[PDB]
Structures are given as structure tokens and as C-alpha cells.
Amino acid sequence: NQYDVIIIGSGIAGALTGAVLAKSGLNVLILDSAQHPRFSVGEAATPESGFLLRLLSKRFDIPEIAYLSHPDKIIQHVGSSACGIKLGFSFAWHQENAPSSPDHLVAPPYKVPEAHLFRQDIDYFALMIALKHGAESRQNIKIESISLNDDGVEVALSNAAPVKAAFIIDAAAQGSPLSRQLGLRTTEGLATDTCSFFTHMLNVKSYEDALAPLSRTRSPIELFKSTLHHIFEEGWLWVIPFNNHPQGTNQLCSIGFQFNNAKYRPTEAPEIEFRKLLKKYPAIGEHFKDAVNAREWIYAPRINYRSVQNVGDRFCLLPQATGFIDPLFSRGLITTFESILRLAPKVLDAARSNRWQREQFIEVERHCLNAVATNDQLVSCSYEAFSDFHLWNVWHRVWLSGSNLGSAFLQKLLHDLEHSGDARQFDAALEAVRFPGCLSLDSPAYESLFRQSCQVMQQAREQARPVAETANALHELIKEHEAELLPLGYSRISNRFILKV
Numbered sequence: 001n002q003y004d005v006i007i008i009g010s011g012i013a014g015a016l017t018g019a020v021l022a023k024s025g026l027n028v029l030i031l032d033s034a035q036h037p038r039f040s041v042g043e044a045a046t047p048e049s050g051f052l053l054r055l056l057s058k059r060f061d062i063p064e065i066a067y068l069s070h071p072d073k074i075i076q077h078v079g080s081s082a083c084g085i086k087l088g089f090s091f092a093w094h095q096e097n098a099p100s101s102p103d104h105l106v107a108p109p110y111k112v113p114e115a116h117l118f119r120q121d122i123d124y125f126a127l128m129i130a131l132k133h134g135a136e137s138r139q140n141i142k143i144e145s146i147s148l149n150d151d152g153v154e155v156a157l158s159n160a161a162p163v164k165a166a167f168i169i170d171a172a173a174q175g176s177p178l179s180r181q182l183g184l185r186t187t188e189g190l191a192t193d194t195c196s197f198f199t200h201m202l203n204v205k206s207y208e209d210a211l212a213p214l215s216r217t218r219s220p221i222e223l224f225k226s227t228l229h230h231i232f233e234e235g236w237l238w239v240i241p242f243n244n245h246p247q248g249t250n251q252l253c254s255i256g257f258q259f260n261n262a263k264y265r266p267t268e269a270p271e272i273e274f275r276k277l278l279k280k281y282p283a284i285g286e287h288f289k290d291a292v293n294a295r296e297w298i299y300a301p302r303i304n305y306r307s308v309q310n311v312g313d314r315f316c317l318l319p320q321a322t323g324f325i326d327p328l329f330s331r332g333l334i335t336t337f338e339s340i341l342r343l344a345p346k347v348l349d350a351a352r353s354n355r356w357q358r359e360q361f362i363e364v365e366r367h368c369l370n371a372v373a374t375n376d377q378l379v380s381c382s383y384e385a386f387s388d389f390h391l392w393n394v395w396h397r398v399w400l401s402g403s404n405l406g407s408a409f410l411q412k413l414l415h416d417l418e419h420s421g422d423a424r425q426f427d428a429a430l431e432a433v434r435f436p437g438c439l440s441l442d443s444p445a446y447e448s449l450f451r452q453s454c455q456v457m458q459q460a461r462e463q464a465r466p467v468a469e470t471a472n473a474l475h476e477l478i479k480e481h482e483a484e485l486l487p488l489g490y491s492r493i494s495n496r497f498i499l500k501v
């Protein structure tokens with residue numbers, strides 16, 4: 001074998017995987033059919049994704065990875081155009097044929113800033129990390145075939161000799177060639193059925209200028225300095241600025257709109273569907289009076305999928321290649337970074353003992369498949385909560401409380417790793433969590449709240465129950481589990497801006 005590991009895809013997933021494996025002493029080859037620089041979706045970081053990047057950095061002693069968790073460090077070390085700022089999530093609710101109210105808002109602020117990742121710059125920088133640690137990169141390639149044998153993997157290339165390795169990691173997202181050839185991917189069983197239109201734009205007005213200033217909203221954060229979700233019965237639209245950081249130079253704003261295909265199927269070109277949306281929701285339209293498109297729209301008719309398996313003797317599919325649900329709540333980067341964190345030590349142990357069996361990587365699969373199933377429940381129930389603001393307001397606390405517990409758990413793991421300096425103990429601690437792929441990771445009390453709340457939302461959809469009844473039932477569930485959650489006052493529904501500590 002020419003190499004130890006072949007990685008397909010040189011996006012952030014493949015690049016970071018390549019970096020940690022090469023740093024740890026594997027001969028790595030990264031293959032990509034495109035070349036940098038190149039646009040990619042997946043821009044909103046979360047408290048979880050930030051901690052997971054710092055864990056990867058700390059676990060494998062690669063300081064440059066930790067830079068990617070902080071907007072100031074990205075500006076300083078990647079480049080001033082490589083991110084915008086994110087001080088929280090924000091949700092603004094709307095209804096067709098009614099004026100939009102700036103009191104139909106929720107926006108819980110973070111403790112520390114996070115990033116809106118300008119992926120063309122972040123992903124190239126990440127590949128440079130891998131290249132500096134000795135990973136080889138071959139761009140603009142064409143994979144002819146991937147053979148999986150009992151003594152290794154063989155990848156045939158157009159106009160080049162075959163390459164051989166002990167293991168292949170598919171980090172190629174929706175274009176996973178390993179997923180196509182293995183027949184792993186399916187949409188059977190998925191509660192979520194959504195499409196997406198997305199692009200980058202110039203001259204997108206801030207929420208504050210376009211709709212309502214801070215003095216009106218009473219938000220503790222500018223919605224301009226947040227991942228802003230405009231939600232409504234049949235779908236939602238994101239406003240993710242890169243031009244909201246005072247030290248930043250990026251002029252663009254990322255815009256994407258998603259529809260629940262059960263409620264509305266688009267019939268026309270992206271720009272026409274966009275205009276129809278702004279007519280339906282004029283308040284959303286106030287962002288876009290002077291705005292112009294800085295790339296072509298991308299349309300994806302169905303963004304949701306899962307897999308029945310994602311590891312074998314000689315392969316692993318990373319999360320995007322395995323499964324995706326929706327941009328809502330930004331679980332994609334979380335699932336990805338944690339999967340790398342779990343996979344990489346196991347691949348190192350496999351390469352060091354020369355043992356390559358499916359059972360060695362079973363916990364990577366367990367985490368990934370569980371994460372997609374959790375995210376499917378989370379998102380499908382959220383799309384049902386879009387029908388009414390008061391319902392959304394109560395429902396968002398189910399997600400928030402879970403995410404807050406998950407982030408606290410990852411912070412504690414990082415804290416313990418930094419103090420003990422013990423890598424094996426961290427790996428075991430991550431694997432020992434009682435609910436891998438779930439929002440809290442390890443809280444049985446929370447996962448009871450989550451499961452019961454999701455059952456309430458599905459029953460509400462199935463039986464067309466009134467929204468006031470559904471909201472009240474969720475309120476009582478939150479109250480019932482309060483003591484077991486973090487002491488943030490989640491049951492205080494009148495407080496729409498839940499603060500930390």
C-alpha cells in the first residue's frame with residue numbers, strides 16, 4: 001500500500017481528518033474532484049462545534065485548529081474576510097396576510113462570540129493545516145472505482161496510476177461515491193422532508209435597519225450579529241452575515257430558504273421562488289430592497305437522507321456522507337467534528353496493530369446514526385412548531401435546554417483533558433456517554449423531556465390538536481423537568497431572551 005489512509009473530499013471534514021492523522025504519523029492522501037478555492041454551505045457555528053474544534057486541537061496538539069472556533073482568531077490568523085460574528089441564535093416568526101411583529105422574537109445570547117464561517121477561506125486554511133503536517137493532496141481528480149479487499153483499499157484514477165491504502169474515509173458529503181457504490185443511503189423512515197435554495201448576497205440590510213432597532217425588540221444582542229431565522233408555517237429563511245464584524249472585511253451575507261415539502265412544493269426558478277416568498281412575507285422583504293446576488297442560486301429539492309450503516313472493515317463515511325436532516329439548528333458541523341474526534345484514535349489504533357475489522361469502529365456508527373435520528377425528530381417537530389409564535393416560544397426551550405447541557409458536558413471534557421493531559425481517558429469518557437448523538441450527551445432527565453416533548457408535537461401534527469393545548473402540554477413538561485436542567489428559567493415563557501448563568 002502506498003498510503004495508510006485515503007480521504008475523499010478536502011472540505012473542512014476531510015482536511016481536519018487529514019491533519020490529525022498526518023500529525024499522529026499516518027501517510028495520508030486527500031482526494032477531491034473540485035479544487036480550492038470553492039464555495040461550500042454550512043456556515044453557522046454553535047457552542048458545541050466550538051468546543052469540539054478546541055477538543056480536536058487539544059487532543060492532537062494542533063493549535064491552528066482551535067483558531068477556527070473563535071471569530072477574532074479567524075480574522076487574525078486565517079484572514080479578515082474569513083468570518084462574520086455570531087453572538088447567538090435568533091428566531092423571528094411571521095404569518096401570511098398579517099403584519100409581522102417585532103415581539104414575535106426569541107434570541108438567547110451566548111456567553112462568548114462564535115463564527116459565521118466563510119467556508120471558501122476556512123476550508124482552504126484547513127487543507128493548509130493538513131498539508132503542513134505532511135498529508136498529500138490531489139485536487140481536480142476523477143475516481144474511476146474504489147475496490148475494498150481483505151488486505152486493503154484500491155482507488156483507480158483517470159489518467160494516473162492506482163493508489164492503495166489500508167483504510168478509506170469518505171468526507172465527500174452528498175456526493176459520497178462510497179455511499180452510492182455500497183447502497184447505504186436511504187430516505188425511508190425520515191420524518192423531515194425539506195428542500196433548500198441558497199446563495200450569497202451583497203447589500204443585505206441588517207435586521208436593526210430593515211425591521212426594528214434594539215430599543216424596540218429589547219434583544220440583548222443585535223440580530224445582525226446572530227444567525228437569524230425567519231420562521232413561518234411552511235418553512236424558514238436564514239440571514240447569516242459575514243459583514244457584521246467590526247474588524248472584518250467580507251461584504252457578503254449568506255441567505256437560504258427552506259420549505260416543508262409536505263406543506264409547499266416550489267414550482268419555478270430560484271429567483272422567482274425568492275420573489276414569491278418576499279411577496280408572501282413583506283417583513284422578510286425589507287432585508288432585500290438594495291440587495292444583489294453575488295453568486296448563482298443553488299436549489300436542492302430534497303436535502304434529507306440517512307444511512308443504514310457507515311463503517312466497515314476498510315471504510316468509514318463521515319456524517320455528511322452518511323446523513324443530513326436540515327440546516328435548522330446547525331447540527332451538521334457538530335456531528336462532523338465529534339465523529340472525527342471518535343474515529344481518529346480508532347484509525348490510529350487500527351494502523352498501529354494492523355487490525356481492520358468493522359467491530360473496531362462500531363461506536364463511530366452508533367454515534368452518527370443516533371445523531372441523525374435525534375436531529376430528524378428535533379427538526380420535524382420544530383417545523384410543526386413554526387405554525388404559531390407562542391408554540392414556537394415554548395418549543396424552542398426544549399432544544400435550548402438540551403444544547404446548553406451538551407455544551408456544558410463538552411466544556412467539562414475539554415477542561416478535564418487540559419488538566420490531566422490524558423488522551424486515552426478523554427476518548428473513553430466521550431465513548432462512555434449514555435446518549436451519544438443526543439443533545440445533552442449524558443443527561444437521562446433531559447432525554448426523557450426531549451422524547452416526551454417530541455411525542456407531544458407528533459401527536460399534535462397527526463391529530464391536528466389546537467396550538468394552545470400543544471404549547472401548554474410542552475410548558476408542563478419543561479416545568480416537570482426544571483430542576484434537572486441548567487438554572488436559566490426555561491419555563492418563564494414571557495422571557496423571550498434567555499440569559500446565561
Ligand SMILES: Cc1cc2nc3c(=O)[nH]c(=O)nc-3n(C[C@H](O)[C@H](O)[C@H](O)COP(=O)(O)OP(=O)(O)OC[C@H]3O[C@@H](n4cnc5c(N)ncnc54)[C@H](O)[C@@H]3O)c2cc1C
Nearest residue numbers: 009011012013032033034042044172173175327330332333
Ligand atoms: C443547505 C445546507 C445548509 C447547511 N447549513 C449548516 C449550518 O448553518 N451549520 C452547520 O453546522 N451545518 C450546516 N450544514 C451541514 C454542513 O454543510 C456540513 O456539516 C459541512 O459542510 C460538512 O463539511 P464537509 O467538509 O464534510 O463537506 P464539504 O464542505 O461539502 O466538502 C466536501 C468535498 O468533497 C468533494 N467531493 C464531492 N464529491 C466527490 C467525489 N465523487 N470525489 C471526490 N471528491 C468529492 C467536494 O468537491 C468538496 O470539496 C448545511 C447543509 C446544507 C445542505
Ligand SMILES: [Br-]
Nearest residue numbers: 066067070073
Ligand atoms: Br486559540
Ligand SMILES: [Br-]
Nearest residue numbers: 389390393493
Ligand atoms: Br408568547
Ligand SMILES: [Br-]
Nearest residue numbers: 471472475493
Ligand atoms: Br403555556
Ligand SMILES: [Br-]
Nearest residue numbers: 491492493494
Ligand atoms: Br411565564
Ligand SMILES: [Ca+2]
Nearest residue numbers: 003004026027
Ligand atoms: Ca505508514
Ligand SMILES: [Cl-]
Nearest residue numbers: 327330331332
Ligand atoms: Cl446543520
